[PDB]
């Protein structure tokens, strides 16, 4: 059965990144189902530590640890066993009374806090990976468009000449700082609240550093109230999602205006556009609009979370709003989709050059030139060139046909004085590619300037990937160390007692 | 004329920190008036740099720089001269045509972006100072209450025994991470977008590193689009305010429940409470409620800013919502007020000890004890002690009068079996101060454990102050260097030409 | 298998209304799956109208209408057939080319707009029903507590004596105005945008009034742009949910403070409370806190929707945020839960009377009495009674033991003058039940005053139910008329051609 | 001194409506200063009623009422006398002890609640007036553009031909429903909570209907808790502002795209555009962007208010966020500005007709035609016409040059079959003005259809104005009745005692 939406101008298949936008909603787990595997890790690491502290005998420990494996498999099909007390009770039906001892010196409060942190931890690494993939597409694309002269806009009005590479490296710098936000957040998420128990700790001599290490954390949430009452990292995760997607919305909006029937300076790749069920001519920006809709929706969780924190005391509370899997799934899908839009975007280079040359974005260089040559102040030069534009529009003269006669009229009509400049000066000022070549300082659109910041982004991307790799490898190490300690106890009990 | 609100039980004056809450609203500047002094700094630093680059002659430079001083003084009483173009025009009326040359290679876009950053920069240091003052009061107060036994709550129900020092050190840990957020933000605020001009730079050979250094920045916003289109730091500043104040709201809510007529475990200092104009008995928590109202209002700017970013392209845009002075003024007033509430809070130690001993917060230790002594699993022990509570309530027995007979009944009625524990074990378990002494791991309420994290917070506060001092001193250095360079040009022109 | 959470003090089963809070999240449909049955109604009504307009022959119509039945059944298990174009294509595989003609003069834009309206329509009636059930429990409960003297609070400080019936009738008045909001909204939701097609109508001679009537609408969205671009009713639905649940959060917070270990003026019914997995004494207000969490989350959709509307033009747009089934499901569950909390709430009448008599909420009547008897101004009387309270607290005198000596001291110590009142006046003023009986104006807690507004709420509830019944019956009528017209065409084609 | 921003292409003065956007921020009152005149009305009406109830002697009443006049004048320059207790104390310094008796049976709680309602009441009428002025400009403008053929957009892609009048009447229908929202809100704002006193009424025999009538209310907030705890009308006022401005943002965004350098289908009037301080060619849409920024900011108050309601009990609370004067002032300025933008907008009719004829918005009529003539299903016809567009773009054929050869190619290349239609059918289908004339059902762009809904909007606007007039006149009547009753008492005391 074919894809019934790939009709008319929607040729080929949806790009896989484009399809994500339609799939994540119905495939998203509940928070309960997504956190549940991490709770089971906590059960194992907590029991291991209880064993190493002499609170559980090695017999008791091995019986429990083997029960968790059995119950974990039951809960794969029985959703009711995914909250703690149903889980504990089913473990008691599987190995008996000893099951209850896995909760010594522990609570649902610090269990839930740790499990949700572990879930948000992986989803944070999942996000950093996607945001790195987003930046790479952006930077790779910039490197191919150092010569693609085009206008930049301000207030949705043509401003000055630049290049597509210049524009894309603004997104790279936006994404670099969003990656810092995410890494900063990670340091506060990857703290372990286990050992806080209900909110006040326990008399049982737990080793909180041990449970924290086995579960992949880089440190502890020290104070026990903060361990269960702390939620600011949930609000911050929601925020960074919101702020990052707002920049993604702006790019998607920028590209959507580029690809209007009236601009026609860019065209979406067919694999990222849909059609209309009624209007055959439509090549619709469904990818851009559905991506932005995910950006708008990220406002919701952030507001919900902060409202819930403003409404309570500094306590554990069941009234606090969560950051849900479906919210992150939406962020990932949009990020993947815009990664694809950017990689496959088709710039219409000739109409780009045309707008830059004809629609008066070069007037600033005409103004600056009068100031460089005849030495008038900028406000006066600006007033003359304004008259030039006003007159040229009235007379239908495109910017690149503006000449000496017209510049002389405006100076006269505005100051009574002529102005001492040559036809060649005007010609230089009105050449959009020279507008680019002259803007060669740090962060400006000249090729050697944009290439320089691309090289910097290359070096920064290598560090981004390195940070991601070390963080991913660290969690894998602790996960492997935990699985070893678990088999160690199960085999020790099997052989020596 | 006396303060007509200090009547009835509202004895003495309002605490000055309490009065701030009523004064900041009517005293708050507009964004235009608050940013305007920083724009004038930018005019000076930008002109200095234009001079050092040979774009302005030293004569032109000195004439401009002297004009800014004159116009700055005019604008102290003429509000209309506080936006750029009115300012430029009044400088032209004061020194003539040369005034226009101060805008060479510059725009209102990067001017405004830099000026607002400078304003938010100082207000960020102002906030860190207040948040440090908030943490100091919290930690100083904790150090005096290592022995103040009291219950901690979860879900607004008495949970386990702790101390006031333990509770306050949860706030200290919350504030430490909010200080990290603010310092992380500072690094992104203290970047200079000047040199971006409209959005694309300029042909004029500016030294952007020079203007950035003279104005106190630690680096550049490199890409020129990001220089004018970047706003994520405004949204992040709004967020950290929102999240930090949400924790402040929770403490104020915690203290407000403490000081209810029904709890009576704490009392606000008279200088932080008001009365009722109708009900003479009221000692009202106006300080707490008005502080929380500031926390709720901080939701607004954050949402407004992110909405505006979701609604535009990646451009300079006049449609973006600002972070207003009055919003920060509200944060500061609430922070100062809660600094005062915490310092002067009166804990009712005896009723604190009473609740801890009588209202069953010690039952967990009774449960843990059965598990330590007779070795039953925790779920079974928990079921027995639950029956103990149910029966003791039915019979009006306070927790600390629970004895061997009752524990034996419940075990029998629940398991058919007696339970092998002594009267002295039960007595230990039910002593609320021993509940505290036994919770002696990291982050737990035992005095030696709370004293340990106080010492850590002492060391962290010293670093907080050091970071603040270095950051404040750096801006003062650059401000002094700028003022010197300005006088240098004015005196060079006066003597040699 | 028993409910593993019903342990300790959590005796019996969860109340069914309480269980809803834990079930709705995993059971909630996607917007696609919830709107899909209504789209199929639209297909039928649209085709019927096309037939009555002579755009489809009766043969074509019957073939289509029979295909929809077949495809509807396929889509019950094939989720992919629940968006339009997959559905149309599968109808074409089932009856052939004629399938395409069901889309004549129609678009996905006005189809989706109408289908979502129909979904929100039923969910709005579902909400009004639940909110009526909420008000009935509130009013029924008030009628049983005209004598339950208790203090009302302001700023979480005891204010004046009232009764539980008085308090509950404030909620009834809050709910009456929320029912008006919902009915006002309904009139704007129940308008039909079908006939707008893409956004501009069509040349095909549709009868829009006909399609609107067959689908249960009370009128048209007239202008065709408004038909597809209109979304304000989605934002308003989100808002009323948010504002109504905020009042529900406040009641749940009110009851949660009532049921603290320190207040003890009310107790949740065991079927609406949980326990702790660690602390056996806990009787936790899970119902209240989880209900409030739904109130906080309703902030999200509202903000998401309005953000999306602020970010677009006045057009159809795929970027607009929806009101999702899971959001409404949360509202319903919380409303049902608080309906149960209110019905089964256990007021502790004796401790209610005790607080009212001892904790100084009667001082206003003491103040008013001095003004009635000796004729001093209220500010002076208020200052005397304030001194009375201050002294009585210092000396440990409960309010109801305040006598003539004390009142005379305070007047002397404050004015130098005695005060001409009798021991019996003071005794009257300090009797909390007389405080109630004297507050007998409109809306005040005296029994005859509260009974009067209960009778009014009875009459209003009868009208609420009548409006609901007429609105439900109207949709059922149109649904039946539609099903008849569909069978009419299928049988006409079967017999005569 | 001239307006230094009216330079370059910013010719003439700012339109006064445009200037409002820059003035309201610095001119906005605090909530305290804006509510204060209404509090003084309440003092008068409350005292009058106390007199009519025999609680005050006519001597006492006249002394008070004359004092309020004196103190009102003092508070015009002394801001400290604008909150209640400072005001009462200064009235006591002016007429003596009797001043205190004006507060009998009253509180700051119901005083503040009523005063803020009165303030929001007038500001609501102020808003309805502005929104009516907005709709009139929209409808007046539509009536002049029944022939202005232009494309409508969906997803920012050209959709189908319409007219400017058709588009504007979508805004009129949006505004009609926003006027209903505002009138619905008004009925809940114009209820009087006075008589509730602290929260529970009073023993003093007040006539609440009397005070309510003298102050212009149409009814009472009956229950006394609801009288002081009720805030839902504040949240609803914030919402309707937010939702209405979101529609205003969308129009401003629509017009801003119209007026891009690339669309050029509309141009802002010079009096509603600014220029750039650097780029002389800029004709910037400052009016549109600053209007949208007001729409985004209206998100803030709404969120702040609902957060504060979610964070408290159902009580009077000083923690509730207000709707501030500056928020409404922003709404009014934007509404006035867009009223001016719409009235003075310059449509470029020829380029409008050009886009409609050349850029393929007529393809739906080409598709519908194949279905009408040869009877193929819509999906097949749609696939053929899609191929037509794809081929015509490839070959550079504008829509209106599409002919029989091309249509025949596509049918063949897509179905193998030719298609039985004439050159004249195709020509009809591709004529954009006939696309309009054929869309002649309810709400469609045909002139006789748009003229019909203009006549309806005319009739609705007359009713809008009538409702506004009756509501304004009613408040003026009660204000005059109050002023009479006040002079009555002052003159009665002067003559007879």
Coordinates of C-alpha atoms in Angstrom, one line a residue, chain C residues 10-348:
Chain C
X10 CA -5.1 3.2 53.0
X11 CA -8.0 0.9 53.9
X12 CA -10.5 -0.3 51.4
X13 CA -10.4 0.2 47.7
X14 CA -9.6 3.5 46.0
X15 CA -12.8 5.3 45.2
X16 CA -13.5 4.9 41.5
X17 CA -13.3 8.7 41.1
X18 CA -9.9 8.6 42.8
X19 CA -8.7 5.8 40.4
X20 CA -9.6 7.9 37.3
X21 CA -6.6 10.1 38.2
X22 CA -4.2 7.2 37.6
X23 CA -5.9 5.7 34.5
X24 CA -6.7 8.6 32.1
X25 CA -3.0 9.2 31.0
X26 CA -2.4 5.8 29.5
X27 CA -5.9 5.5 28.2
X28 CA -6.1 8.8 26.4
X29 CA -6.5 8.8 22.6
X30 CA -4.5 10.9 20.2
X31 CA -6.3 13.8 18.7
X32 CA -6.3 11.9 15.4
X33 CA -8.0 8.8 16.8
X34 CA -10.5 10.9 18.8
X35 CA -11.5 13.2 15.9
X36 CA -11.7 10.4 13.4
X37 CA -15.3 9.2 14.1
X38 CA -16.5 12.8 13.6
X39 CA -14.7 13.1 10.3
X40 CA -16.7 10.0 9.2
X41 CA -19.9 11.7 10.2
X42 CA -18.7 14.7 8.1
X43 CA -18.1 12.4 5.1
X44 CA -21.6 11.1 5.3
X45 CA -23.3 14.5 5.9
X46 CA -21.2 16.1 3.2
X47 CA -22.0 13.4 0.7
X48 CA -25.7 13.5 1.5
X49 CA -25.7 17.2 0.8
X50 CA -23.8 16.7 -2.4
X51 CA -26.5 14.3 -3.4
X52 CA -29.4 16.7 -2.5
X53 CA -27.6 19.3 -4.5
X54 CA -27.4 17.1 -7.6
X55 CA -23.6 17.0 -7.6
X56 CA -23.6 13.2 -7.0
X57 CA -26.0 10.8 -8.6
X58 CA -27.9 8.6 -6.2
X59 CA -25.9 5.6 -7.5
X60 CA -22.6 7.4 -6.7
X61 CA -23.9 8.5 -3.3
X62 CA -25.0 5.0 -2.2
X63 CA -21.7 3.4 -3.3
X64 CA -19.7 6.0 -1.3
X65 CA -21.9 5.8 1.8
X66 CA -21.6 2.1 1.8
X67 CA -17.9 2.3 1.4
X68 CA -17.5 4.6 4.4
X69 CA -19.1 1.9 6.6
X70 CA -16.6 -0.7 5.3
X71 CA -13.6 1.6 5.7
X72 CA -14.8 2.8 9.1
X73 CA -14.6 -0.8 10.2
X74 CA -11.1 -1.3 8.7
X75 CA -9.9 1.9 10.5
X76 CA -11.0 0.4 13.9
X77 CA -7.9 -1.7 13.7
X78 CA -5.8 0.1 11.1
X79 CA -4.7 3.3 12.6
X80 CA -3.1 4.5 9.3
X81 CA -6.6 5.0 7.8
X82 CA -7.6 7.7 10.3
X83 CA -6.1 10.7 8.4
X84 CA -8.0 11.9 5.4
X85 CA -5.9 11.0 2.4
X86 CA -5.1 7.4 3.6
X87 CA -8.8 7.1 4.3
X88 CA -9.9 8.4 0.8
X89 CA -7.4 6.0 -0.9
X90 CA -8.6 3.0 1.1
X91 CA -12.2 3.9 0.1
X92 CA -11.0 4.0 -3.5
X93 CA -9.6 0.5 -3.1
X94 CA -13.0 -0.6 -1.7
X95 CA -15.5 0.9 -4.2
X96 CA -13.3 2.4 -6.9
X97 CA -12.8 5.8 -8.6
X98 CA -16.1 7.3 -7.4
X99 CA -14.5 7.5 -4.0
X100 CA -12.7 10.6 -5.0
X101 CA -16.0 12.5 -5.6
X102 CA -16.7 12.7 -1.8
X103 CA -14.2 15.5 -1.6
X104 CA -15.9 17.8 -4.2
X105 CA -16.0 21.4 -2.9
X106 CA -14.2 20.3 0.3
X107 CA -10.8 20.4 1.8
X108 CA -8.8 18.9 4.6
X109 CA -8.8 22.4 6.1
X110 CA -12.6 22.8 6.7
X111 CA -12.9 19.0 7.3
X112 CA -10.4 19.2 10.1
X113 CA -11.8 22.4 11.5
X114 CA -15.3 20.9 11.6
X115 CA -14.2 17.5 13.0
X116 CA -12.2 19.0 15.8
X117 CA -15.2 21.3 16.7
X118 CA -17.5 18.3 16.8
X119 CA -14.9 16.5 19.1
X120 CA -14.6 19.6 21.4
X121 CA -18.4 19.9 21.3
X122 CA -19.0 16.5 22.8
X123 CA -16.1 17.0 25.2
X124 CA -17.6 20.4 26.2
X125 CA -20.9 18.7 27.1
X126 CA -18.9 16.0 28.9
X127 CA -17.2 18.8 30.9
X128 CA -20.5 20.6 31.7
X129 CA -21.9 17.4 32.9
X130 CA -18.9 16.8 35.2
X131 CA -19.0 20.4 36.4
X132 CA -22.7 20.1 37.2
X133 CA -21.9 16.9 39.1
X134 CA -19.2 18.8 41.0
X135 CA -21.6 21.6 41.9
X136 CA -24.3 19.2 43.1
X137 CA -22.0 17.5 45.5
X138 CA -20.9 20.9 46.7
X139 CA -24.5 22.1 47.2
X140 CA -25.8 18.8 48.6
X141 CA -22.9 18.9 51.1
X142 CA -23.6 22.5 52.1
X143 CA -27.2 21.7 52.8
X144 CA -26.0 19.2 55.5
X145 CA -23.7 21.7 57.3
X146 CA -25.7 24.8 58.0
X147 CA -24.8 24.4 61.7
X148 CA -21.1 23.4 61.3
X149 CA -19.5 26.4 62.9
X150 CA -15.9 26.9 61.7
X151 CA -13.5 29.8 61.0
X152 CA -13.0 31.1 57.5
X153 CA -9.4 32.1 56.6
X154 CA -7.8 35.1 54.9
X155 CA -4.1 35.0 54.0
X156 CA -4.1 31.6 55.7
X157 CA -4.9 33.2 59.1
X158 CA -8.1 32.7 61.0
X159 CA -10.5 35.5 60.1
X160 CA -14.1 35.2 61.3
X161 CA -16.6 32.5 62.2
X162 CA -18.7 31.0 59.5
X163 CA -20.1 27.5 58.6
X164 CA -19.0 24.8 56.2
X165 CA -22.3 25.4 54.3
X166 CA -21.3 29.1 53.9
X167 CA -17.9 28.1 52.6
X168 CA -19.2 25.5 50.1
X169 CA -21.8 28.0 48.7
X170 CA -18.8 30.2 47.6
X171 CA -17.7 27.3 45.5
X172 CA -21.2 26.9 44.1
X173 CA -21.2 30.5 43.0
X174 CA -17.7 30.0 41.5
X175 CA -19.0 27.0 39.6
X176 CA -22.1 28.8 38.4
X177 CA -20.0 31.4 36.6
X178 CA -17.7 28.7 35.2
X179 CA -20.8 27.0 33.8
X180 CA -21.7 30.3 32.1
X181 CA -18.2 30.5 30.6
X182 CA -18.6 26.9 29.3
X183 CA -22.1 27.6 27.8
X184 CA -20.9 30.9 26.3
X185 CA -18.0 29.0 24.7
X186 CA -20.3 26.3 23.4
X187 CA -22.2 28.8 21.3
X188 CA -18.9 29.6 19.5
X189 CA -17.8 26.0 19.2
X190 CA -21.1 24.8 17.8
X191 CA -20.7 26.8 14.5
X192 CA -20.0 24.9 11.3
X193 CA -17.1 25.9 9.0
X194 CA -17.9 23.3 6.3
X195 CA -18.3 24.9 2.9
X196 CA -15.2 27.1 3.4
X197 CA -13.2 24.4 1.5
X198 CA -9.6 25.4 1.3
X199 CA -10.3 28.9 2.7
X200 CA -12.2 30.6 0.0
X201 CA -15.3 28.5 -0.6
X202 CA -16.0 26.9 -4.0
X203 CA -18.0 27.2 -7.2
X204 CA -19.8 24.0 -6.5
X205 CA -23.4 25.0 -5.3
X206 CA -23.2 23.6 -1.8
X207 CA -25.9 24.1 0.8
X208 CA -23.9 25.0 3.9
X209 CA -26.9 25.3 6.1
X210 CA -27.8 21.7 5.2
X211 CA -24.4 20.1 6.1
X212 CA -24.4 22.3 9.3
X213 CA -27.8 21.0 10.4
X214 CA -27.1 17.4 9.7
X215 CA -23.9 17.5 11.8
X216 CA -25.7 19.1 14.8
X217 CA -24.4 22.7 14.5
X218 CA -26.6 25.7 15.6
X219 CA -25.2 28.0 12.9
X220 CA -22.4 28.7 10.5
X221 CA -18.9 30.1 10.6
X222 CA -19.9 32.4 7.8
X223 CA -16.8 33.9 6.3
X224 CA -14.6 31.2 4.6
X225 CA -11.3 32.4 5.9
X226 CA -12.6 32.5 9.5
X227 CA -13.9 28.9 8.8
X228 CA -10.4 27.5 8.4
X229 CA -8.3 30.2 10.1
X230 CA -10.5 30.6 13.2
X231 CA -8.9 29.0 16.3
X232 CA -10.0 31.4 19.1
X233 CA -12.5 28.9 20.3
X234 CA -9.7 26.4 20.9
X235 CA -7.8 28.9 23.0
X236 CA -11.0 29.8 24.9
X237 CA -11.7 26.2 25.6
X238 CA -8.2 25.8 27.0
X239 CA -8.7 29.0 29.1
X240 CA -12.0 28.0 30.7
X241 CA -10.4 24.7 31.6
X242 CA -7.5 26.5 33.1
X243 CA -9.5 29.1 35.1
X244 CA -12.1 26.5 36.3
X245 CA -9.3 24.1 37.4
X246 CA -7.6 26.9 39.2
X247 CA -10.7 27.2 41.4
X248 CA -10.6 23.4 41.8
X249 CA -7.0 23.7 42.8
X250 CA -7.8 26.3 45.5
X251 CA -10.5 24.1 47.0
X252 CA -8.2 21.1 47.0
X253 CA -5.6 23.3 48.7
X254 CA -8.1 24.5 51.2
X255 CA -9.1 21.0 52.1
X256 CA -5.5 19.9 52.2
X257 CA -4.8 22.5 54.9
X258 CA -8.0 21.5 56.7
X259 CA -6.7 17.9 56.8
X260 CA -3.2 18.7 58.0
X261 CA -2.0 17.0 61.2
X262 CA -2.0 20.5 62.7
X263 CA -5.4 21.8 61.6
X264 CA -7.4 18.6 62.0
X265 CA -10.7 20.3 61.1
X266 CA -11.4 17.8 58.3
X267 CA -10.3 14.4 57.3
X268 CA -10.3 12.8 53.8
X269 CA -12.4 9.7 53.4
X270 CA -10.1 6.7 53.4
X271 CA -11.2 5.9 49.8
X272 CA -9.6 9.2 48.7
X273 CA -6.3 9.0 50.6
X274 CA -3.1 6.9 50.1
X275 CA -0.3 5.8 52.4
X276 CA 3.5 6.0 52.3
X277 CA 5.7 3.0 51.2
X278 CA 8.1 4.0 54.1
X279 CA 6.2 6.0 56.7
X280 CA 3.3 3.9 58.2
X281 CA 1.6 6.8 59.8
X282 CA 0.9 8.7 56.6
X283 CA -2.6 9.3 55.4
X284 CA -1.6 11.1 52.3
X285 CA -3.8 13.6 50.3
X286 CA -2.9 12.0 46.9
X287 CA -6.3 12.8 45.5
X288 CA -5.9 16.5 46.3
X289 CA -2.4 16.8 45.1
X290 CA -2.9 14.9 41.9
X291 CA -6.0 16.9 41.2
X292 CA -4.1 20.1 41.6
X293 CA -1.3 18.8 39.3
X294 CA -4.0 18.5 36.6
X295 CA -4.9 22.1 37.3
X296 CA -1.3 23.2 36.8
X297 CA -0.9 21.2 33.6
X298 CA -3.9 23.0 32.0
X299 CA -1.7 26.0 31.9
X300 CA 0.3 24.3 29.2
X301 CA -2.3 23.8 26.4
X302 CA -3.6 27.4 26.9
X303 CA -0.1 28.9 26.5
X304 CA 0.8 26.6 23.6
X305 CA -2.3 27.5 21.7
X306 CA -2.1 31.3 22.2
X307 CA 1.7 31.2 21.3
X308 CA 0.9 29.4 18.0
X309 CA -1.8 32.0 17.2
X310 CA 0.6 34.9 17.9
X311 CA 3.2 33.3 15.5
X312 CA 1.2 33.1 12.3
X313 CA -1.0 35.1 9.9
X314 CA -4.8 34.9 9.7
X315 CA -4.7 31.8 7.6
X316 CA -5.1 28.1 7.9
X317 CA -1.8 26.8 9.3
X318 CA -0.5 23.4 10.3
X319 CA 1.6 25.2 13.0
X320 CA -1.4 25.8 15.4
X321 CA -1.3 23.9 18.7
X322 CA -4.3 21.7 19.5
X323 CA -6.4 21.0 22.6
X324 CA -5.5 17.3 23.1
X325 CA -7.8 14.6 24.4
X326 CA -5.4 13.8 27.3
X327 CA -5.8 17.4 28.5
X328 CA -9.5 17.1 28.8
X329 CA -9.3 13.6 30.3
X330 CA -7.2 15.1 33.0
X331 CA -9.7 17.8 33.7
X332 CA -12.6 15.3 33.9
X333 CA -10.7 13.0 36.3
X334 CA -9.8 15.8 38.7
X335 CA -13.4 17.1 38.6
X336 CA -14.7 13.6 39.3
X337 CA -12.2 13.1 42.1
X338 CA -13.1 16.4 43.8
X339 CA -16.7 15.6 43.4
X340 CA -15.9 12.5 45.5
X341 CA -13.7 14.3 48.0
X342 CA -16.4 16.9 48.7
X343 CA -19.2 14.3 49.0
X344 CA -17.3 12.1 51.4
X345 CA -15.3 14.7 53.4
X346 CA -15.4 14.2 57.1
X347 CA -15.5 17.5 59.0
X348 CA -14.3 17.3 62.6

